[PDB]
């Protein structure tokens, strides 16, 4: 029971006729309920006459004086900030854009998909007069257009978008303002001199408080940059802090939060290989628009009350303070302000996990995952389809929705075409059937791994258990296995999201080991578990072990490089030196997985070593220097770290 948003017929309009059926797209746009009264009125002057914004202007004035006529200058400066921040929505512009996007999307997307039952729950959240917060996952540039367009198509008033200062340029900026995008400064720092702009913070905080006070829907991307690995990066708690600061003071009654999972079959930007490693524009843009991409599916997670969440947290016991170093180091080597700063960081992480889980599994996503890990060398089309059907059902067994819904045979033939740069379709002698082999070259591999990462969040937990089984072997004690897997969670903590922030890594592995008993892979003999020895079960175990190949091999390779590290180094210079070493391994052909050379896994590897405390980080001016820690100063300790990460990866 889904709905296509792009599909428009004489049935969708009120008037049916020879003329009307031709102008169907125009008739649909003239039947929307966007009548201008609902949007924010007189924002600028309502922000200027807020007590704190006046206190900020009043204090910045009291700094510049060596009687006090300089309030007008800083007030005029403060007005000029708001002039280029606040969005002025024009429903005239909305309808024109909506008509253009309906034509453009219908060209280069095969369809867009909405679950009706979900969007009735968003409609119910609109029917209550109370402000909403739409928090989507950032995948592509098309994310900005999709969320607004889907509400506009169900005549829910268009949201105000927290727009990056990057997009603010002459002429083009005022078009964004008409469509509800309000530009926000990056880093709340105009210049180092004076530190934070007390004036600018007051205006930003004031604007958001004023915009929520008039009961209107807000859209914030928690991931500052769109993901280049193909999986959700770490959260940013910058704007949520203001929203919670609003609700904390009891200036507004309550806010409803909606995590939004957007999924593409093939993103418009295509591959990311260029940034994943290290006239002319006009040719590239025209070549992009003519290419027809696959399906799209936007899912809305059930909305919750921020007040009810924030209360529920205040009832919970003492938050665990276990440090990543304090957790792991024992295994490898045998505050009033901070409490709230943790509370917002947890909320942000909690939303992104809910948002990431809501994203549907596309045909491409599965095909990539099967090609890279289940076969790799190459397999026949008839054989690939039989494996595709077995993969398809495993995703539905864990309660994830699929984007593809057609015939199993066809969907794969459609999916292979979209990965045409990565894949080659040959002919086997004496076999009237297509043979497929994925590209193992460093430029091509990355593109497959990007679309393959789409399915990783389904199997990430079982994969952590599947690796632990191999680690504990080289009968299994229940307590011993879970403790081993719990340590691997802290190691792979930095990359992606593994569990909900409320649940500890122990109990998640403990219930995942519980699920392994249900499936019948492990059987009960503290308790002793036996691994089942069947042709069907083993190929599932080996699949899950290979699925954490790149993630572990990158860390293994990074840990080897750490051996020959001398003297303090700048991090931006160090990342380049480390990245080159992983790229070298793929050229020499000593590396098992070419996927591991990706830049995202280099950032994670270095950011992970900081948390364990291999690198001591003192920072000055802009760039932070990396000093070798007192614990990992000697040669023997660096080898002990390498050995531990090696124990997980297959040999
Ligand atoms: C049918 C019609 C269709 C119509 C079509 C419509 C289409 C229109 C197009 C619209 C275009 C839209 C573009 C959207 C994009 O491209 C997305 S660009 C990301 C934007 N949003 C964000 O940036 C999200 C994250 N925001 C932030 O992080 C911030 O907003 C900044 C940004 C300041 C960075 O932050 P900064 O570098 O300053 O560092 P910070 O670490 O965040 O610290 C800043 C301050 O934030 C507070 N804070 C931070 N962490 C916490 C925390 N955990 N708990 C509590 N408070 C916290 C605290 O005040 C600490 O200050 P200090 O540095 O002094 O500690
Ligand atoms: C503002 C709304 C007005 C309505 C019109 C909007 C229509 C959609 C605009 C097209 C989407 C944006 C195009 C971005 C182009 C771009 O960024 O180039 C692609 C490269 O990075 C990819 O490089 P690589 O990662 O090396 O493959």
UniProtKB/Swiss-Prot annotation:
Query: What are the alphabetically sorted keywords of the record?
Result: Acetylation, Acyltransferase, Lipid biosynthesis, Lipid metabolism, Membrane, Mitochondrion, Mitochondrion outer membrane, Phospholipid biosynthesis, Phospholipid metabolism, Phosphoprotein, Transferase
Q: Name one Pfam family in it.
A: GPAT_C
Q: Name one GO biological process term.
A: negative regulation of activation-induced cell death of T cells
The reported effect of residue 288 to W is: Impairs catalytic activity
Show the disulfide pairing: none
Q: Please list the reactions this protein catalyses.
A: sn-glycerol 3-phosphate + an acyl-CoA = a 1-acyl-sn-glycero-3-phosphate + CoA; (9Z,12Z)-octadecadienoyl-CoA + sn-glycerol 3-phosphate = 1-(9Z,12Z)-octadecadienoyl-sn-glycero-3-phosphate + CoA; sn-glycerol 3-phosphate + (9Z)-octadecenoyl-CoA = 1-(9Z-octadecenoyl)-sn-glycero-3-phosphate + CoA; sn-glycerol 3-phosphate + octadecanoyl-CoA = 1-octadecanoyl-sn-glycero-3-phosphate + CoA
What the protein does comes down to: Mitochondrial membrane protein that catalyzes the essential first step of biosynthesis of glycerolipids such as triglycerides, phosphatidic acids and lysophosphatidic acids. Esterifies acyl-group from acyl-coenzyme A (acyl-CoA) to the sn-1 position of glycerol-3-phosphate, to produce lysophosphatidic acid. Has a narrow hydrophobic binding cleft that selects for a linear acyl chain. Catalytic activity is higher for substrates with a 16-carbon acyl chain.
Q: What is this protein called?
A: Glycerol-3-phosphate acyltransferase 1, mitochondrial
This protein's encoding gene: GPAM
């Amino acid at each position: 029971g889904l709905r296509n948003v792009i599909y428009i017929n004489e049935t969708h309009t009120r008037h049916r006729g020879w003329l009307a059926r031709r102008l169907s797209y125009v008739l649909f746009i003239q039947e929307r309920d966007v009548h201008k009264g609902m949007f924010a009125t007189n924002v600028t002057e309502n922000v200027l006459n807020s007590s704190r914004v006046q206190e900020a202007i009043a204090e910045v004035a009291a700094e510049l004086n060596p009687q006090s006529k300089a309030v007008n200058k800083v007030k005029k400066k403060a007005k000029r900030i708001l002039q280029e921040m606040v969005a002025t929505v024009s429903p005239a512009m909305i309808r024109l854009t909506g008509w253009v996007l309906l034509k453009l999307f219908n060209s280069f997307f095969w369809n867009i998909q909405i679950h009706k039952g979900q969007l009735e729950m968003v409609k119910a959240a609109t029917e209550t007069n109370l402000p909403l917060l739409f928090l989507p996952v950032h995948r592509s540039h098309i994310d900005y257009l999709l969320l607004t367009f889907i509400l506009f198509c169900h005549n829910i008033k268009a949201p105000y978008i927290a727009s990056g200062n990057n997009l603010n340029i002459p002429i083009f900026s005022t078009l964004i303002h008409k469509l509800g995008g309000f530009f926000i400064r990056r880093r709340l720092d105009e210049t180092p001199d004076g530190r934070k702009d007390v004036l600018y913070r007051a205006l930003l905080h004031g604007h958001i408080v004023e915009l929520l006070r008039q009961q209107q829907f807000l859209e914030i991307f928690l991931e500052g940059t769109r993901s280049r690995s193909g999986k959700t990066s770490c959260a940013r708690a910058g704007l949520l802090s203001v929203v919670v600061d609003t609700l904390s003071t009891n200036v507004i009654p309550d806010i409803l939060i909606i995590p939004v999972g957007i999924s593409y079959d093939r993103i418009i930007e295509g591959h990311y290989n260029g940034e994943q490693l290290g006239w002319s524009v006009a040719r590239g843009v025209i070549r992009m628009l003519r290419k027809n991409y696959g399906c799209v599916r936007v899912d809305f997670a059930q909305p919750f009350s921020l007040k009810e969440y924030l209360e529920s947290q205040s009832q919970k016991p003492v938050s665990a303070l276990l440090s990543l170093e304090q957790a792991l180091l024992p295994a490898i080597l045998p505050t009033d302000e901070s409490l709230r700063r943790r509370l917002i960081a947890n909320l942000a992480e909690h939303i992104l996990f809910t948002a990431s889980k809501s994203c549907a599994i596309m045909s491409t996503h599965i095909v990539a995952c099967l090609l890279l890990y289940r076969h790799r060398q190459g397999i026949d089309l008839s054989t690939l389809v039989e494996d595709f059907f077995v993969m398809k059902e495993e995703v539905l067994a864990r309660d994830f929705d699929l984007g593809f819904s057609g015939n199993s045979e066809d969907v794969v033939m459609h999916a292979i075409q979209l990965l045409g740069n990565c894949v080659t379709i040959t002919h086997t002698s004496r076999n009237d059937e297509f043979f497929i082999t994925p590209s193992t070259t460093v430029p091509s591999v990355f593109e497959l791994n990007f679309y393959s990462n789409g399915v990783l969040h389904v199997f990430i937990m079982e994969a952590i258990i599947a690796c632990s089984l191999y680690a504990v072997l080289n009968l299994i004690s229940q307590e011993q296995l879970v403790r081993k897997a719990a340590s691997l969670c802290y190691l792979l903590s930095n990359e992606g999201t593994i569990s909900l922030p409320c649940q500890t890594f122990y109990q998640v592995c403990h219930e995942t080991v519980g699920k392994f008993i249900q499936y019948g892979i492990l059987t009960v003999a503290d308790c002793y578990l036996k691994v089942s020895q069947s042709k069907e079960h083993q190929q599932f175990i080996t699949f899950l072990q290979r699925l954490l190949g790149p993630l572990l091999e990158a860390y293994s390779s990074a840990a080897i490089f750490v051996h020959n590290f001398s003297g303090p180094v700048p991090e931006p210079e160090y990342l380049q030196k480390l990245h080159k070493y992983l790229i070298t391994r793929t050229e020499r052909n000593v590396a098992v997985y070419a996927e591991s050379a990706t830049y995202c896994l280099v950032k994670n590897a270095v950011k992970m070593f900081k948390d364990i405390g291999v690198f001591k980080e003192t920072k000055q001016k802009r760039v932070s220097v990396l000093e070798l820690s007192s614990t990992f100063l000697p040669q023997c300790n660096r080898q002990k770290l390498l050995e531990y990460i090696l124990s997980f990866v297959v040999l």
